[PDB]
Design a protein around this ligand. Structure first.
Ligand SMILES: *[C@@H]1O[C@H](CO)[C@@H](O[C@@H]2O[C@H](CO)[C@@H](O)[C@H](O)[C@H]2NC(C)=O)[C@H](O)[C@H]1NC(C)=O
Ligand SMILES: *[C@@H]1O[C@H](CO)[C@@H](O)[C@H](O)[C@H]1NC(C)=O
Ligand SMILES: *[C@@H]1O[C@H](CO)[C@@H](O)[C@H](O)[C@H]1NC(C)=O
Lengths: 97, 22, 48, 88
């Protein structure tokens, strides 16, 4: 079914004999050649330290809130460390972060 | 003719008889 | 149209979710698009 | 950045494939994307520099086979519909 274009016609017609005419078999695809990727060049490791290697955490009713932006982040180290009891993500694959 | 006035897997085939033949 | 899925583009589904749990969203999108195609084809047949 | 070829690109999470030609669409004083009737990212502004790249999808095409009855002969003529086959 993939040797020469007559064989595709034979496959599609589901017979060994094909009558005169035009027959549509498949589609033509152009394939991409490379994987160009562009990201902004600003590098500033946001400090996950004081949010993780902290000294004191607030109360439940007064939970601490922090904003995070402008990050060249690295979650590989976060996953690699086993010092944490539980690590569970919702809606995102942890390894694909 | 004067009074009488896309890229997601759909195509438009051209008619067999062009307007010249008609 | 989301059709109840979390995104209307399948690229986000493949590039965000883990493989083994993206099938639900992919199936919902497939069902919606298939139904739309069926309705369009039937309408075209009647008009033809 | 390389253009005029069918490339798989990635612009700050914008994922897709096509030809990223250089087009002077409009000002885009603060907007980044370029849309159309559908949810199509027609135009994109570069993340490093500031240029208006125009995205065009890769070529579609159906394949048909001209052939006489197989009783007569076995030669065939392939037809790629709506393909400006200067590039196979
Ligand atoms: C501060 O946090 C960093 C990472 O979040 C910790 O760094 C790692 O700590 C483990 C613990 O043994 C080491 O095995 C790794 O080699 C460390 N990695 C790096 C890049 O240093 C660090 O231990 C934390 N410090 C404190 C005081 O909690
Ligand atoms: C970094 O990005 C800025 C964005 O405006 C650009 O002006 C600059 O030339 C870039 N520099 C390098 C070394 O990539
Ligand atoms: C097909 O490609 C050639 C080479 O670029 C070009 O000259 C011609 O105009 C194209 N055909 C159409 C219909 O645009």
């Amino acid at each position: 079914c993939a040797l020469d274009p007559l064989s595709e016609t034979k496959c599609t017609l589901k017979s060994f004999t094909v009558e005169k005419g035009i027959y549509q078999t498949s589609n033509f695809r152009v394939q991409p050649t490379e994987s160009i990727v562009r990201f902004p060049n600003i590098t500033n490791l946001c400090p996950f330290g004081e949010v993780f290697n902290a000294t004191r955490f607030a109360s439940v009713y007064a939970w601490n809130r922090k904003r995070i932006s402008n990050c060249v982040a690295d979650y590989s180290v976060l996953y690699n460390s086993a010092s944490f009891s539980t690590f569970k993500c919702y809606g995102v694959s942890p390894t694909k972060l | 003719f004067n009074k009488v006035t896309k890229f997601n897997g759909l195509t438009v085939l051209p008619p067999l008889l062009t307007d010249e033949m008609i | 149209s989301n059709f109840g899925a979390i995104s209307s583009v399948l690229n986000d589904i493949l590039s965000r979710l883990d493989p083994p749990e993206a099938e639900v969203q992919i199936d919902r999108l497939i069902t919606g698009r298939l139904q739309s195609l069926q309705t369009y084809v039937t309408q075209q047949l009647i008009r033809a | 950045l390389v253009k005029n070829k069918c490339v798989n690109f990635n612009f700050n999470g914008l994922t897709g494939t096509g030809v990223l030609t250089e087009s002077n669409k409009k000002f885009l004083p603060f907007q980044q994307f370029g849309r159309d009737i559908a949810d199509t990212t027609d135009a994109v502004r570069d993340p490093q520099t500031l240029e208006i790249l125009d995205i065009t999808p890769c070529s579609f095409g159906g394949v048909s086979v001209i052939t006489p009855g197989t009783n007569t002969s076995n030669q065939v003529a392939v037809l790629y519909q709506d393909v400006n086959c200067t590039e196979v």
